[PDB]
Symmetry: D3
Subunit: 303 residues, 6 copies
C-alpha cells in the first residue's frame, strides 16, 4: 500500500528512508529538457496507494520545488489514494512575513502551490517559524530536531552542564531558551546593530550557536568572532538545515569552531570533504518513523 | 463612496475614526435574541460602496467576532463594492501555532472565517505574531503602533536617551530590538523558565517594558519587580492592546510601574476610573488615515514610521 | 475507529450518546481565558479515526459555535479521517432568508463556517426550515422528531383521535398539516396581524401547539390565550428545541398548558425544576443510532 | 457601460427590458448543433462592461439553462467587468430540499452551476422558496411581484376591500398573509391531504388564489371548486410565473375562474390565443428598474413595495 | 461495495456493463415534469458505496447533462464514498478553445460543472482532443478506441496492409498518422478551402476515413466523394462517437461507403435498421474492465 | 493607473513594451539568496493600480516562473486593483496532455499556480496548443503572431504567391492551413514516424516551415533536408518562440535554411552574434497594444489579424 519516491537527483536521504521501512524507491523517470524544463514520469501504478515524496536538494530551490509539485500532481491525477510531501527543509521558509516591506509572503505562496498541486498532507522538520503550519489547510506534521540536537550536546560537548546556548539573531530567542531550559544551562543572544551586540553570560564557558539555517554563514561567522571576544572558552555551531553555499564553506574553516553540527536535510557529503569539523545528525529514522505512523494511523506526537 | 460601521454598542473608536473623516456611522439595527443570537440589519443601502466595519471592544470575543462576521455578510449580499474589516485588536491572535500540542491554529480559523464571510481586505494593528498576514489570501495592512509609541517615549520620558527597552518574554525580541535601535539605546530580555531570568544591562537606567498585549498582567508585574531588582531606576510598561481582564487592575495598582501605557484598540475609559496609572495613546487617527488611504489608493506604508 | 467528543460544559446528551454506543467521551481539555477566548486541546490521538462532535448548549450560542468550530479544526489538522458535526439544534437557523431586509443569511454563514473549519458531514435534527441542507456542499443527515412527537401525543393525550394541531405562526402550516395528517386529526393556524387571528376548527377539542423552537415564548404564550378564547377544551405545547431564556420560564407557568413537551437538544434539567408541566423526549438513541449507521455505512433513511 | 443580452430566440422580455432602458440587445450568434449542442458567439466586445443576461422563456428548461451558462462563460472569459444573470423564473426552484426522499437539492446545484460558470450577481423574481438566496455566495436580488399584484387587485377587483386571499397549499401561507395584511383583509388556506381542506372564512367573499407558479393547474382548479363550494362569490387565480404546460389550458378554460392573472416572466402570447381568461402583468419595468439601479448603485429594495 | 446506475432512458450500454461485472443496475426513479424539469430519485442507499454513473444518450445533450449532474449530486449528498462519471462521449467536447472568437470554452464549463456537482473521477473514451483531461482537477481515465479500431481494420478490410488512413479535417493529422503507423500503411489528409483539397497518396488503394465524431456528416460525406475522384479503390468510415442526427443517416446511404464503423457510445440500434453498411464495435468490456480496475486499484494503463 | 514590471534582469522586452506606452518600468529590488531563493521587493505602491508583469526570457524556466509567481503575490497583497501576467512564451506549454503516459499535465499546473498566486488575467502569444485558455478560469488573451508572420512573408519572400506552408509535425496542421489560406497558397505536412514523410506538393516552390517554437532544432533541420529532397527551391523556417538551446545554433548554421525567423518573445541578441541566419520580428508593439487595450477596455481581438 505504501510507496516512496525521491524527488531529485538526490537519493541519499530518500534511499535511507526506504531501507528503514523495507522498501524500494518507486520507479520514476525524471528528465530536464535542454531549455531547463522538468519532465517527470511515474514508471508504475500508484493507484489506490499511499504515496510519499521526499524532496531532492540538488542545490537549486526552484527546480526542486517544481519537480516536487510536478510529482505530487502526476500522482494525484493518477488516482493516488493520498499524497504527502516529505519536505524536511521547507522551501522559502524565511519569507513568512512582509517585514515592513511590499514583500511577498513566499512561504504562503509555496503552501498554496503545494496545496493546489494536490498534496493532502505535509511532513516537515524544524520549520524556521512554526506558524507555517497555519499557512496550510491540510494536516502538517512538523517534526523536531530538538531531541536529536540535545542528544548530541550531551554526548559530544564534555563541559555542557555549565554551557551557554546562543542565538545568532534577535528572532531566535524562543528557540535557544527552550534548548537552554532542557539542559539547565544559561542562554545568551546576539543582535547586529553594523556593530554586533551580545546579551547574556558567556565568559569562560562553552558556547553553542544554535540556529535553524545558515546560507552565506555571514551572520554565524561574525557571531563566533564576537563570542570569542566576549571570552567564551570554546565555540560550536548547530544548524539543522545546512544550505552552505558560496563563501560559507571556506568561512567555516577560517572560523574558530571546534565542531559544526548539521542534519542531513541537505546532503553534506561533498562538503564534509572540504571541512573536517562538520558532523551530521541522521534524521532518516525520524522521517521513516513519521511515515510509518502516518500510514498506520499511529501517534506521531511521541516523536 | 466610503461607509463606516461599528459592532455591538461599543461605538467609541468607530465614532472617533468616523469624526476624523468627517462622517457619521452607518445605521445598524442590532439587538440580541434572548437566545444569545445576534440579529443585525443594515439600515441603509451599501450598493457599490466602499464599506469599513470596525470590530467593537465590548469584551465578549466570540460575540464580537460573530457580529463582525454577520455584518460582513450582510454588506456583501447587499452588493457592496468592497468590505474591509478593520480589526485593531485581532481576535485569537495568540493561537497561531499548534505549539507541540494538539491545538487548533485559531488565528488561521478566524482568518478563514473572515474570508468566507465575504471580507475583501483587512486593516489591523501590531499582530501578536506578524505572520498572520500569511493566514489570508486577501490583502492585509498590518499597522505599527511603534511610531506612536516612540513619540510617546521621546516626550513623556526624560531619560529616554539612556533607557533600556525590555521584552517581557522571548517572543518579543524582534520587537524590542527594533525600537531600541530607532531610539539608539539598549535592549533587555526577560525569560520565565517555569523563575524569570534577565539578560542585558538595566542598571541605573529607566526600563521600558514593551509588549503586544497585557491580559492578567501576571508576567508584566513580575517583570517590573525583576527589573527593579536588577538595578533599574524606574519601570514603564507599554502595551498596544490593553485587555486588562481578571486581577490585572489589582496587579497594576500594587505593581511598581511609574505608568502603564495602552493604545485605545480596547477601550480604557472605565479602567482609568479604577486605575490612575493607565494612560491612553489615541490610535484613531492612524486607523482613520489607513481607511482614507485604502479608499484613495494612497500609500498606507507611510504610516509605518510616521504619525499622522 | 469511532470517537466521540462533547463540545461544551454540557455533557449530558453527549455522555448519553457515548453510553449507547459503548464508548467513553474523548479526553479533551477545554478552557476559557479571562478575556473570554476559547482554548481547546484534544488530549488524545484522533489520527485515522472517525470523529463525532456533539455541540454544547451552555446557553451561549456564539461560544458554543466557536468551540464547535475550534474542535472540528483541531481534529481536521490532526489528521482525523472524517469529522462530523452532531448539532441537533442548528445555530442561527432562523436567519435562512433576508425577509425584505438588508439582513444576513446567517444560516448560510454558519454553514460556510462549519465547512471551512473542516467538517465533512452534518448530523442535525428537525431544522427550522429544510433548505438549510442546501446551504452545505457536504452531506447533511437531518433527523426527524416527527416519529417521537407522534408517539408522545398518542401515549399521553387521551382525547387525541379528535384533536387539533395548531401552528403559532403563518410559516408553520407545512409542519402542523403533516402532524395532523398522520394522526387523522384536524389542523388550525394562528397569524398575528398586534391582534392575533385563528383559522381552523378548535372549539371543544384538545389543542396542541407544535413548533420547532420558542425563545421568549411571547408568541406561543399568546397563542395559548387565543386558543382558550376560541374554546378549546385543553391546550398543549410541543417545542422540539427548547431555548427558554429570559421571561419564558415564568411565562409558561402563568400559562394554562396541561403539558409542555420538549426534546433534550437543549438541557431542561435546571428548568424542569422551575416548571412541573414540562416533559422531555429523549433524542439520544436517535442520535446514537444515526452515528453508528453513518460510521458503518448503513441506512439512516429508516430513522 | 451597460450591456443586455437574451437567450435562444425568445427575445420578448429582453427586448421589452432593453426598450425601457433605451438600448438595443447585444448581438449573439447562436444556432444549435444538430447534435443538440448549443453554440454561442458574442458578436461584440464586452471588455470592462457591466453585462446582463436575461434567461429566455422558450420552454426547454435544460436547453435554456445550458445556454444561460454558456453565455455567462463567454462573457467572463471575454473580460467583462461583471456578469449578472437576470433569471425572472428561476429554474429547478421547486427542488430546494431533499424532502425525506433521497433527492438532489437541484436549486443549490443550479446555484453552484451559475456560480462556477462565472456569474457575479443574480436578479430574480419571487423565488418559490425565498431561502434560495442562501444557496449562493454572490449577492442575489429577489424582486417581489407582490406590489404589482396588489396594484392589480385594487383596480381590477371592485370587492377587494372585502375579499379573501387564498393559499392553494400550506407552503404559501407566509405569502398570502402578508398580502392580506397590506390590503387589510382576510386570508384562507387550502391543504390537499391525499382531498382538499380549507381553513378560514370565504363565505360571500371574492376569493383570490395567490401562488408562485402554475404548472398543470391540477391544484388551482380543484381549489376553485373548493372555494365556490365553501361559499366564495367568485374565484380569481394570481400567479407570478405562468408555465401552463400539459392540460393546464384545458384545466383553465373549463375551470370556474373569473380570470387567471400571470406576469410575463414566461411568455403568454400564444397561450392567450387559446385562453381568453389569461391576463398579463408586465414585469419588464420592474426588471429594467432593477438592472438600472444595479448599474448605478441605487437602492433596488425600493422596488420591494413600490411599482416603478 | 460497487454500484452502477444508468443515466437516462437509455439502458443498453449500462445494462451491458452491469452484466459483465455480475451486477444489477441501481434502482432509480427518473421523471420529467411537464415543464421539461428533470426529477431523479435514488431508490436505494448508496452510503459508503463506490458509485458509477453511465450517461444516457437519448439524443438530447442538455437533458442528458443535467440528469448526469443531478445524479452525481444526488449520490454525493447521500454520502456516497466516491462518485465517477462514466461518459464515453464527453459532452460539448468540440468547444475546447475559442477559435479566434468570443466563444465559450464549453468543454471547460462542463468539466467545472461535473466537478462542482460532486464528481471525484471521470471515465471517458477517445476524447475529441486530449487536453480535456487538463480541464479537470480530479483524476480522468481516458480510454482508447485505438486498439478496437485497429482490430477491426485488420479483421474486416482484406487489402489493408497497403491501405491509406485519411483525416476529414486539418485538425485530425495526429490521430490518423498514429493509426497509419501501427498498421504500417500510408496516411493522407483533407482540408476544406468551399473547395476540398487532398494531400497524400490515395490512388488505387483502400481508403479509410477515421474520425472522432460526425454530426451532420456534411464533412465526411464530401470527404468520400473527393477520395473517389482521387481514385481510391474503395472507401470506409470509422467514427468512434456516432451522433448521426438530421440528414446524416440518409447522407450515408447515398454515400458510397462499403462500411461505416462506429462504437456503441451512442446507440445505433434504431439507425442500423435504416442503414445496412453500419457495424458497431462493442465498448462495454473496455468500460466494464475500466470500472473493475478503478474500484480495485488495479492498472487501467494496460487498456 | 497602469504599471508595468519585469522579471529578473532580462529587461529588454519589458523596456520595449514600456517605451511604446510612454512609461518607465516599476522599481523592483530583486537579488537571489545564495541559496537560490529569490527575493523580490516592489519599490513602490501599487495600491488600486492596474499592474502588468512581463515574464523574463533569461533562460532558467523554473527560476523565471517562481519569480513571476512571487511578484504576482507581492502586488496582490499590496492591494493592486488587478495583476495581469504577460507571458509571451508560456512555460511548460508542451506538457498539456498525459499522452498515454503517466505524466503530469504541467500546463494546467502552471495555470493553477498562476491562479492561486493571485493572477487576474493572462496575456500570452501563440500557445503551443491553444486549448490552454481552457486551463484557466480567469480570462486569457491568446495573441496571434500570425498577422506579423504573414506581413513578414509578403515583403521578405518574393515567391510568396507560389510558396508552400509546411508543418514540421502533425500537430501544426491547423496552424499551417489557416496561414496558407490567408495567402491563398499550398500547404504541406511532414510526419516523423520513428523517418520523415511528407504529404503535399513542394516541387519548384519556396517552402516555409511554420512552428510554435524551436528548441534543439533537430526536427526543423531534418525537415529542411526533406523539403529540398522533395523538390523545394529554398527553405525558410518561421518560429514564434525561439528558444535555441543545446546544439540548435550548430543545427541552424549547417542547415540549408535561407533564413530562420523568430519573434522576440525570447531574446535573440546574443544568438545573432553567433548566427547570421536569425532575423527577429519585433512583437513588443503587439504586446504593448494588448496591454493598452486591456486597460482601456478596448477590443484586443482587433490584433488577431491586424498588425498595429
Amino acid at each position: 500500500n505504501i510507496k516512496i519516491f525521491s524527488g531529485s537527483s538526490h537519493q541519499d536521504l530518500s534511499q535511507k528512508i526506504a531501507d528503514r521501512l523495507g522498501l524500494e524507491l518507486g520507479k520514476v523517470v525524471t528528465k530536464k529538457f535542454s531549455n531547463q524544463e522538468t519532465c517527470v514520469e511515474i514508471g508504475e501504478s500508484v493507484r489506490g496507494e499511499d504515496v510519499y515524496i521526499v524532496q531532492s536538494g540538488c542545490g537549486e530551490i526552484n527546480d526542486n520545488l517544481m519537480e516536487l509539485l510536478i510529482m505530487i500532481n502526476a500522482c494525484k491525477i493518477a488516482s493516488a489514494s493520498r499524497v504527502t510531501a516529505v519536505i524536511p527543509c521547507f522551501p522559502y521558509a524565511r519569507q513568512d512575513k512582509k517585514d515592513k516591506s511590499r514583500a511577498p509572503i513566499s512561504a504562503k505562496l509555496v503552501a498554496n502551490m503545494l496545496s493546489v498541486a494536490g498534496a493532502d498532507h505535509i511532513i516537515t522538520m524544524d520549520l524556521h517559524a512554526s506558524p507555517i503550519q497555519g499557512f496550510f489547510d491540510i494536516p502538517v506534521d512538523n517534526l523536531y530536531a530538538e531531541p536529536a540536537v540535545l542528544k548530541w550536546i550531551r554526548e559530544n560537548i564534555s563541559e555542557w552542564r555549565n554551557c551557554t546556548i546562543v542565538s545568532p539573531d534577535a528572532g531566535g530567542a524562543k528557540r535557544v531558551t527552550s534548548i537552554a531550559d532542557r539542559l539547565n544551562v544559561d542562554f545568551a543572544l546576539i543582535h547586529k546593530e553594523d556593530r554586533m551586540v551580545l546579551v547574556g553570560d558567556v565568559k569562560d564557558r562553552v558556547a553553542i550557536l544554535v540556529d535553524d539555517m545558515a546560507d552565506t554563514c555571514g551572520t554565524i561567522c561574525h557571531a563566533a568572532d564576537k563570542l570569542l571576544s566576549a571570552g567564551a572558552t570554546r565555540v560550536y555551531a548547530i544548524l539543522t538545515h545546512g544550505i552552505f553555499s558560496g563563501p560559507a564553506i571556506s568561512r567555516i574553516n577560517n572560523a574558530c569552531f571546534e565542531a559544526v553540527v548539521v542534519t542531513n536535510t541537505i546532503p553534506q557529503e561533498d562538503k564534509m570533504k572540504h571541512c573536517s569539523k562538520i558532523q551530521v545528525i541522521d534524521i532518516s529514522m525520524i522521517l521513516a518513523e513519521a511515515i510509518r505512523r502516518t500510514h498506520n494511523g499511529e501517534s506521531v506526537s511521541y516523536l
